[PDB]
Design a protein around this ligand. Structure first.
Ligand code: HEM
Ligand code: HEM
Ligand code: HEM
Ligand code: HEM
Lengths: 108, 146, 141, 141, 146, 108, 108
């Protein structure tokens, strides 16, 4: 996908700025709004609504992006599967190396 | 927003007893039912056509906690609402296109819900405290409009 | 104008008020006076102290006028048309105040009617008090 | 409801609009869009630029609806009943917007009718536009 | 209250051509006529019984100048309305008890009067400038209410 | 007093229009507003607030005037004493004759 | 009068704080509101509405008090005569001494 490309590191969690529920891109707005399920390395994450995601199996969509807890993040390669109502699951790939997570790919 | 040391004690004592899972959603639910034009903003929530549709719609309950959560920063930071709500103000005006009049409405519905749950304990003085808090939050969200 | 369904809710809920009309009327004024103190000054002569006799008196006057409008629902504009001159022509009541008192009446009704103050009923009452508001300011229109 | 002289003022002043209906309609929308940009978001696909063709089109549609409601001062709720369902049930237009547009209509009328926008006529028009406003939001109440 | 360069210049250019004695009186005139409940505050101005009684009442024309004069301090200090109007916010709330809603109404009538005097010159952009100034004055007078 | 001058008859009561709590006469307004006690032929009447006064020992001040129940009204000459925190008792004198009361006098 | 007692010295003017058109004292409020004519040592002053009174034959009633220009003020004793529709003329007396005006008395 040409639209999901980068991420940020936070306390016990990662942020996808471009997964914006208020994005001027009608498609991104609707995808983010309709997220039914997130899996990291097969583990089912929970919608924490507005709590912190610091060291949790939890996600939050808000004005800054999609926030993901790094609890179920292993060393090396990780596989994130975001599902919504009206889109094909987005599979995101990242690399934990000495406790630093770098963006790899996001494909549909 | 100036509250007497009694008003502040009164507010926090009532807030402490509030179901932060439930109350925001009853407020939002009641706004969508009483003031139907508010449905425009939340058409992404699915069916809000009836009081049942609304009070049973998880996107409402969940959204209600974000709203109740937001009032919590408000109560934490009464000295600096304009700032606490500054980023939310930009969002509601620049990105949601929501007229500030609706902030005053939600806040009054929130007050109707507290009165519904707390009965005689929601005394006229305790209301007059919460009416000042809700006019305060309404102001801060309206600031970046100007 | 109110749906058949709205009228049914207003009649049912105001029914439950029964003999507390005057007390609920008086509570709402007190709720208005503390929360919206600009409203105090329409009552220069009154004692606005919590247990005031005059407030309980004016609570009865208002609550009775409402009880009357709940059984003049189709006939409301005609029922309170004398009250409509009084409030516009003599008292010069600011429209804004009808919304504050209406809010305070809902807060009161909500506080006293846990078991029937459903969303559907709160809409119906909210509308109904706006109707009374609309009639009472109608000699500005 | 409108006095005989309210009607007389509204009919006389709206009369002077004549074939400028479309232009005055379009000016008011543009005045609303500049002063209250919150209103622009009801027009997602419309060209809202100065001189827009769609704005002139929508200016005519509105001005004509108003010209219509002048003839039908007596039975307004019945006159614009279909427009009332559209604006409340479909578009969910926020009541607040009818006051902004109405205000911008008076600014337009005032700007274009130096000699006939007398205080008495401004009251009459202000009331009349509030009537249109009230009917247009009447599937809320 | 934040105005672009072209807007601040536009406003002051139009204000410079304004009859300070005449316009204030027509504004307050038109408030007392179009929003009749506003007469409550000015019962001490004698006869406000007709449009003409009101417009030709010397106490009205007089009061008009105080109001219009006060908008002028507003235009002098747009980066400091909150402060310029402070003692006067105190007055309208603490002693007069004016519902701030009426500040927005006067302001909008003021806009109707400018459009009436300046005809085609009161362009939509010029209005949008003056609408910001008038909402600003309204906010400032409302500050010492909370 | 050249301000309290007439009355009307109502169903088991009498009305003094000019005892107006909304009167443009600041003196009458304040008197009516601050009525503490009313006696007819010695009998102490009750403030009924907003109920009917039909055949009662009751008074009501409202937008139409001061409403007085005719219960404690005897045949011939009748004496009404209105007291108000504000100013001097108002004494009204009236004449019941074949169930018809005519105004006579009002004095302080 | 026990109500008018002091004044303050302003630039080319004197201020009577107690002549307050917003006074909670219904008597003072109404007097100030109905001021028809002001004379200093016989000289008729003008209502300048809301301008400055600095070195004028002008008065202004506002929230700070009654402002009087010191133009028609001579050395020693001065006599200020305030007239108002409702009330009898108020005569105020003050003393200029090498450019200091101090209060003497105010009477009806
Ligand atoms: C004091 C009043 C209010 C507060 C405290 C409040 C707070 C919030 C918060 C915290 C969010 C989520 C922000 C995020 O994702 O980071 C939000 C979103 C939103 N609010 Fe409000 N809000 C208020 C009033 C209103 C009103 C009156 C409306 C509409 C009439 C409204 C419509 C919305 C909408 C549409 C969203 C985005 C919905 C979504 O993405 O699902 N809000 N608000
Ligand atoms: C006096 C006030 C108003 C009048 C007389 C009026 C009249 C009309 C008329 C005649 C139509 C066309 C009906 C049709 O297409 O079938 C219309 C459509 C519409 N009006 Fe209004 N209107 C008024 C106020 C407003 C306001 C205040 C708003 C929004 C702020 C608004 C938003 C709309 C919208 C969004 C449409 C649909 C047009 C489109 O996008 O194609 N109206 N109006
Ligand atoms: C919303 C429903 C309202 C109802 C049903 C109502 C009803 C009444 C009634 C029955 C009276 C007594 C009239 C009489 O003596 O004949 C009255 C008087 C009055 N009302 Fe209202 N009213 C309403 C709203 C308001 C509001 C909002 C205000 C002011 C904020 C107000 C201010 C007054 C005042 C000042 C009086 C006169 C008090 C006196 O005579 O001592 N009313 N109203
Ligand atoms: C932008 C809005 C307004 C401005 C700038 C404004 C300004 C002023 C000023 C300068 C004064 C004179 C105070 C003094 O110098 O002592 C005043 C007095 C007053 N204003 Fe306002 N005002 C505004 C709105 C209103 C409104 C909406 C009302 C509604 C009733 C109101 C009612 C009064 C009254 C009653 C007085 C005192 C009357 C008198 O003593 O002659 N004002 N205002």
């Amino acid at each position: 996908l040409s639209l999901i490309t980068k991420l940020s590191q936070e306390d016990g969690a990662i942020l996808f700025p471009e997964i914006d529920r208020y994005s001027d891109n009608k498609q991104i707005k609707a995808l983010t709004q309709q997220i039914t399920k997130v899996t990291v390395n097969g583990t089912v994450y929970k919608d924490l609504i507005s709590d912190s995601v610091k060291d949790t199996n939890g996600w939050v969509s808000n004005m800054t992006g999609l926030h993901l807890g790094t609890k179920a993040f292993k060393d090396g390669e990780n596989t994130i599967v975001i599902s919504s109502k009206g889109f094909e699951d987005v599979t995101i790939t990242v690399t934990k190396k000495d406790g630093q997570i770098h963006f790899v790919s996001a494909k549909q | 927003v100036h509250l007497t040391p009694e008003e502040k004690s009164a507010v926090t004592a009532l807030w402490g007893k509030v179901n932060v899972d439930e109350v925001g959603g009853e407020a939002l639910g009641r706004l969508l039912v009483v003031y139907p034009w508010t449905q425009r903003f939340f058409e992404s929530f699915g069916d809000l056509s009836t009081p049942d549709a609304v009070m049973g719609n998880p996107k409402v309950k969940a959204h209600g906690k974000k709203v109740l959560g937001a009032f919590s920063d408000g109560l934490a930071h009464l000295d600096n609402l304009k700032g606490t709500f500054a980023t939310l103000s930009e969002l509601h005006c620049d990105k949601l296109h929501v007229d500030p009049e609706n902030f005053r409405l939600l806040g009054n519905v929130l007050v109707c819900v507290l009165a519904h749950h707390f009965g005689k304990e929601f005394t006229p003085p305790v209301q007059a405290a919460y009416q000042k808090v809700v006019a305060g939050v309404a102001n801060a969200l309206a600031h970046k409009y100007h | 104008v109110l749906s058949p369904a709205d009228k049914t809710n207003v009649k049912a809920a105001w029914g439950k008020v029964g003999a507390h009309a005057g007390e609920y009327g008086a509570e709402a004024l007190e709720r208005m006076f503390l929360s919206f103190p600009t409203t105090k000054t329409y009552f220069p002569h009154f004692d606005l102290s919590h247990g005031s006799a005059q407030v309980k008196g004016h609570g009865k006057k208002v609550a009775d006028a409402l009880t009357n409008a709940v059984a003049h629902v189709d006939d409301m504009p005609n029922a309170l048309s004398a009250l409509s001159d009084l409030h516009a022509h003599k008292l010069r009541v600011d429209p804004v105040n009808f919304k504050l008192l209406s809010h305070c009446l809902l807060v009161t009704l909500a506080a006293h009617l846990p078991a029937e103050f459903t969303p559907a009923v709160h809409a119906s009452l909210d509308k109904f008090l706006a109707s009374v508001s609309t009639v009472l300011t109608s000699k500005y229109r």
